[PDB]
Design a protein around this ligand. Structure first.
Ligand code: SAH
Length: 274
């Protein structure tokens, strides 16, 4: 049956990450039907190579290779987003960012900018709900550039342009009332750069300069000069960069600054306007 095969795997991934879902989605793509199916019928078998291949994808994920990598796609909170080791694997915690962005977009749609887009994750989850407005993605690493461009085309969305330039580098059309961004915010020396899934993502996609504050601070200052007037700059940052990021805005910006929590652990987004 199916299940049988699954547990053959479960015993494997036992310590690496937390097992079952891995296999499920990992085999949910193979003859890969639905997950509700597999649950309903993990009765039904699979072709041999069909199976072996998985038997092999296992070791890959065993050492530690990201599942998403192996699958090559990721359900961002809502959508199918094709991925490629050159950008970040769209984390959920980027809930705050997209939820507050929206909790503030009804107030103001048109002309928005997703900084360091990466894959199109936010820009994309943003533009779909909001075609009334336009979305702009940018990145300084060619792969992510196209990687966004790709996903952008799959779900086939409208009026969003991705680009290759340093943050504001190629930008002059700042009449954005809303800029959003999940930049690199990790300490060059952080030991978490050493744990699990992160040993596999780009230093670029992850590393910030000062203390992990360099790019944050820099888009704040640089990005706010845009003159967005009442417009917002929303940013994602590690749990422990709240106060710093908080302060950051102030020394740099104008309106009430707010640090809103993500899911459980903490503050994961900080915003304020001009
Ligand atoms: N100096 C720079 N100028 C523009 N984009 C940059 C940049 N440095 C990094 N970036 C892009 O911004 C990304 C932040 S990682 C997260 C990407 C995306 N915002 C998402 O939430 O997944 C980096 O991976 C890189 O693709």
């Amino acid at each position: 049956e199916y299940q049988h095969w699954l547990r053959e795997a479960i015993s494997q991934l036992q310590a690496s990450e937390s097992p079952r879902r891995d296999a499920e989605i990992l085999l949910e793509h193979v003859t890969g039907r639905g997950r509700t199916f597999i649950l309903a019928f993990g009765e039904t078998q699979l072709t041999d190579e069909q199976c072996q291949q998985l038997d092999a994808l296992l070791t890959r994920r065993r050492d530690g290779e990201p599942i998403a990598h192996l699958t090559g796609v990721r359900e961002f909170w809502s959508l199918p987003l094709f991925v490629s080791p050159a950008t970040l694997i769209p984390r959920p915690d980027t809930e705050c960012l997209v939820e507050q962005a929206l909790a503030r977009l009804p107030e103001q749609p048109c002309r928005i900018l997703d900084l360091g887009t990466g894959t199109g994750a936010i820009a994309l989850a943003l533009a779909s709900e909001r075609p009334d407005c336009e979305i702009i993605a940018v990145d300084r690493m060619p792969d992510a550039v196209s990687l966004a461009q790709r996903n952008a085309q799959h779900l086939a969305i409208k009026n969003i342009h991705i680009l290759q330039s340093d943050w504001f580098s190629a930008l002059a059309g700042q009449q954005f009332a809303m800029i959003v961004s999940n930049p690199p915010y990790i300490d060059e020396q952080d030991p978490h750069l050493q744990q699990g899934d992160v040993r596999f993502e780009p230093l670029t996609a992850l590393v910030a300069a000062d203390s992990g504050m360099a790019d944050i601070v820099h888009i704040i200052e640089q990005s706010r000069n845009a003159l967005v007037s009442g417009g917002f700059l929303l940013l994602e940052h590690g749990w422990q960069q709240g106060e710093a990021v908080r302060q950051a805005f102030i020394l740099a910006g104008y309106h009430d600054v707010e640090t809103c929590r993500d899911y459980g652990d903490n503050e994961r987004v900080t915003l304020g306007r001009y």
